[PDB]
């Protein structure tokens, strides 16, 4: 209590009432601990802190369902370039529309 009463992580003080324990890991391996806690329902996951941000059990299950980091990191560049990609696609589609219409008219004829 004295340690966290004068710290950044003072929001975890209400969590520490009665018997408590800390599940500690270098990497956020939440899926396996969740799945093994599923076996014994009486055990509640009160909350915790991952990557310097606090989180609740609902948040824990949301994070467990979440995919990894690298695909999101890659999609960041795609989201940034989406505007240019859309402009290029709109430039392309007008000449491409004629070709698509000709191809469709092949089916109709």
């Amino acid at each position: 209590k004295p340690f966290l009463e004068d710290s950044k992580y003072q929001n975890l003080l209400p969590l520490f009432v009665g018997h408590n324990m800390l599940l500690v890991s270098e990497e956020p391996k939440v899926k396996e601990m969740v799945r093994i806690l599923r076996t014994v329902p009486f055990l509640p996951l009160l909350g915790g802190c991952i990557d310097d941000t606090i989180l609740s059990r609902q948040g824990f299950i949301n994070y467990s369902k979440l995919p990894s980091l690298p695909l999101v990191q890659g999609e960041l560049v795609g989201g940034l370039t989406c505007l240019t990609a859309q402009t290029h696609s709109l430039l392309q589609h007008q000449p491409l529309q004629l070709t698509t219409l000709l191809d469709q008219y092949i089916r109709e004829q």
Partner: peptide
Amino acid sequence: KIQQLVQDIASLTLLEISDLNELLKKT
């Protein structure tokens, strides 16, 4: 000429192109 017809729409402006597909939809 097939090439001449292709070159025609190739040199048409976007506004005239937008008229082409709309006329195609009508008929």
